[PDB]
Design a protein around this ligand. Structure first.
Ligand SMILES: Cc1nc(N[C@H](C)c2cccc(C(F)F)c2F)c2cn(N3CCOCC3)c(=O)c(-c3ccc(C#N)nc3)c2n1
Length: 473
């Protein structure tokens, strides 16, 4: 009987998106509301992306976030244009006869197929096009040819029934192209210490104010967190060949984290004088204290990584001189990470904006999803794209997005921003050469047990006492 349903759809030789659903081309999870697609052929994914029966804004969103893991942007545009071009059924025998007598056909089925299948599918295709240009315009910025195809397609759609949708998409494309270029309170005063405004040559860990290091690193990290698009995290594209094109905001975030962490370690192990090194560790702990004040969890866990690093953690003689109060701040910061970040998560959900979440936990959990789930599922010999796997990755990038609209009430300082944008602790060395050298400096400044502890001369010729972390008026 339902076979009567599929004989009212075009044949497989004139149209590819009306073959019946089977266990070997589409799978769902297990209500009587919209089903959850688990796997399918890219043809079945396109069919359901643009399904006639209902709107599906969650599949549209998830599909357009994750599709580059199984389908090129050029191929996606080709498939949805093909989906759009639906052949009309032949006239019935009686209407055939009438047509060649120059008489009006009834066209009952033809009119129904247009209203109930073609029009809605076509509206679903324009809806996909709009979401695509609104939420993923970078696809069109990276590929001027893709944008040319989209505009010709949209510009040749017929009917006043779809005029509205077309004008809307064209508006969004024009707003996006045009883009080519604050506050409710006052921010607090920019804090200075030994370095004075403009005197950039004197900028260093101990010469800048620790309050203002933490503030400027929080602003720079806020912006880097906010620039990351979910698609930069799908199908591990930041760990593969085209990384710089596909994941540029993510790589900037990872490279800042690497550079700040390694710079902290470098500042520590390259201060060979024990008394001066204690001052460096203690200043980095105060920077952490201000990160916490600002709910910059990213920065907090960057300081934790530095102190937990194989070169730093072994410095028994240094941590021996750190006052109890500073050790406790560092211990409680570490404990954020224990038991799969239980206390970090409780803390994140308990605070009020603004914040910078710890980014590393999302990368860890996307990687475990990528490595622990198969790219494709097999049914009856056929390979189906594992969509549930992409959905799981997209839900984690969903968590990232929750926190990307939280600007800080803090003045920028351009020279300090520049100073931290320009961190290059590794020099022209690669990462393993640098970490090996840091460990070997550690051994030199604090040798392993049997050998006793040499003295080393002072390198800093300015006062090492900290101005503290009260902003004071
Ligand atoms: C309270 C605390 N703080 C740590 N680091 C902070 C930032 C820290 C680092 C450096 C100095 C201090 C100082 F203030 F003493 C710190 F608090 C910890 C670091 N690590 N490692 C993690 C991987 O890399 C090597 C070090 C640990 O295993 C544990 C640990 C050990 C045993 C148990 C049990 N049962 N639970 C946790 C830590 N526990």
């Amino acid at each position: 009987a339902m076979a009567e349903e599929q004989m009212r759809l075009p044949s497989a030789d004139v149209y590819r998106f009306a073959e019946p659903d089977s266990e070997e081309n589409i799978i769902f999870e297990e209500k009587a509301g919209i089903p959850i697609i688990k796997a399918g052929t890219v043809i079945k994914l396109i069919e359901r992306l643009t399904y006639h029966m209902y709107a599906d804004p969650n599949f549209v969103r998830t599909f357009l976030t994750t599709y580059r893991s199984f389908c090129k942007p050029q191929e996606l545009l080709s498939l949805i244009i093909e989906r759009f071009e639906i052949p009309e059924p032949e006239p019935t025998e009686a209407d055939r006869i009438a047509i060649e007598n120059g008489d009006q056909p009834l066209s009952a089925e033809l009119k129904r197929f247009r209203k109930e299948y073609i029009q809605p599918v076509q509206l679903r295709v324009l809806n996909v096009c709009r979401h695509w240009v609104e939420h993923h315009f970078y696809d069109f910025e990276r590929d001027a040819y893709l944008l040319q195809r989209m505009e010709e397609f949209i510009g040749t759609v017929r009917g006043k029934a779809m005029k509205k949708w077309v004008e809307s998409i064209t508006k969004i494309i024009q707003r996006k192209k045009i883009a080519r270029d604050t506050f409710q309170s006052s921010p607090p005063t920019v804090e200075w210490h030994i370095s004075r405004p403009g005197h950039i040559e004197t900028f260093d860990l101990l010469t800048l104010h620790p309050i203002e290091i933490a503030r400027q690193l929080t602003l720079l990290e806020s912006d880097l967190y906010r620039a990351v698009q979910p698609s930069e995290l799908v199908g591990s594209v930041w760990t593969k060949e085209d990384k710089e094109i596909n994941s540029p905001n993510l790589l900037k975030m990872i490279r800042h984290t690497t550079n700040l962490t390694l710079w902290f370690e470098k500042c520590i192990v390259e201060t060979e004088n024990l008394e001066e090194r204690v001052a460096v560790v203690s200043r980095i702990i105060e920077i952490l204290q201000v990160f916490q004040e600002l709910n910059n969890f990213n920065g907090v866990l960057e300081v934790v990584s530095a102190m937990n690093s194989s070169p730093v953690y072994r410095l028994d003689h240094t941590f021996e001189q750190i006052p109890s109060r500073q050790k406790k701040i560092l211990e409680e910061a570490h404990e954020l990470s224990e038991d799969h970040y239980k206390k970090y998560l409780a803390k994140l959900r308990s605070i009020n904006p603004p914040c910078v979440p710890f980014f590393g936990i999302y990368l860890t959990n996307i990687l475990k999803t990528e490595e622990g789930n198969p790219e494709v599922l097999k049914r009856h010999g056929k390979e189906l794209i594992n969509f549930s796997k992409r959905r799981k990755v997209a839900e984690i990038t969903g968590e990232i997005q929750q926190y990307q609209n939280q600007p800080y009430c803090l003045r920028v300082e351009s020279d300090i921003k520049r100073f931290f944008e320009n961190l290059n602790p590794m020099g022209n060395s690669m990462e393993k050469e640098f970490t090996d050298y840091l460990f070997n400096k550690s051994l030199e400044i604090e040798p392993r047990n049997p050998k006793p502890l040499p003295r080393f001369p002072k390198k800093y010729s300015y006062p090492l006492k900290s101005p503290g972390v009260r902003p004071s008026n």
